[PDB]
Symmetry: C2
Subunit: 202 residues, 2 copies
């Protein structure tokens, strides 16, 4: 337990990994600062040594490698396929509803984890709570998909705060917007894929 | 040498803290996902930052001369006679800015103020900022800026610096935020008007 003697917030709003002359350096967004050295992904517990690895953290999210179990979040599952797809959705998000529709034709190859987050506020919170508190989750999936979550029978003792953990977690780990799809190989789609089936195969 | 850049990746990092522990200074991202171990260099001032005072310095201070930025080359008007230069970024329609420039008049024996005009509030401020820049006779610029009469300053015959103000772009790039924005002689910044300008201006 080494103590931190001092901490200073630097005027850096962004960082690029830049490869040149057998080295990878870290250059700030307005180009004021360059850092020479080694970067370590504390969440996945590994050094990033190659540009493929830099590309990987920009492009992919590996929940298991980072020790994040999505089933512990406000999650409903659809399908029984051997490859797992993650989708962050708002209960009121129509594009999300459409995505969940396209996914029904894919349940033989994939198991979709729909992570419900009240990204759109107000009524979305009330809905996400109804999902989180529903007694019989076997009907949660259908209610989420039909925007009928409001009617779901609640557990007697279930009253979360307004700051939804799944939302906080998503915000924290860098999930932006809904729907947000993470393919089995970790590739992220910020929005609904043009064609879900093809996008999913790699 | 020189060598080409083979590859570039934008990393998911929105902020960086310098963190001192066990005799080294590490660079930790805003959500704690990444730590960079190694050496940071201020490319604008052309020096290594090796200590926490030096980290604090880039956090707290802006040193124009050291970064090769001559503020007199921006859209700038000067007031006063003092041996110490104070820099203030102002929008021509900014009431707080006007009040600051006003308080500054009582300090001209000790300081020379550089009022760098930026149309941060856009629209009508642009035309005013243009009018200053294109004023043929700059000896009346200070008074026009301070009396909010830049609209009437006679312009050079062929002068239209365009829709995007160079001073504004420069301020944005180097990270000057809001108006007024004060930089003391010792480089210390104030984002807003300091409570008392006179005392604040003295070295600290």
């Amino acid at each position: 337990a080494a103590k931190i003697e001092d901490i200073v917030e630097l005027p850096i709003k962004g960082v690029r990994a830049v490869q040149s002359d057998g080295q990878i350096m870290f250059l700030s967004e307005n180009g004021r600062f360059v850092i020479s050295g080694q970067i370590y992904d504390l969440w996945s517990k590994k050094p990033l040594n190659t540009m493929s690895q830099m590309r990987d953290v920009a492009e992919r999210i590996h929940f298991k490698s980072m020790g994040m179990d999505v089933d512990t979040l406000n999650t409903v599952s659809m399908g029984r396929g051997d490859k797992e797809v993650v989708v962050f959705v708002d209960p009121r998000c129509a594009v999300c509803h459409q995505l969940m529709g396209d996914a029904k034709s894919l349940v033989d190859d994939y198991t979709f984890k729909f992570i419900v987050i009240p990204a759109l506020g107000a009524e979305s919170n009330r809905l996400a709570k109804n999902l989180y508190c529903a007694k019989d989750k076997t009907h949660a999936l259908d209610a989420l998909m039909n925007n009928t979550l409001g009617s779901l029978p609640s557990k007697e003792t279930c009253d979360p705060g307004q700051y939804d953990q799944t939302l906080l977690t998503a915000h924290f780990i860098g999930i932006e917007g809904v729907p947000f799809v993470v393919a089995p190989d970790g590739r992220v789609s910020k929005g609904r894929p043009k064609n879900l089936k093809s996008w999913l195969e790699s």
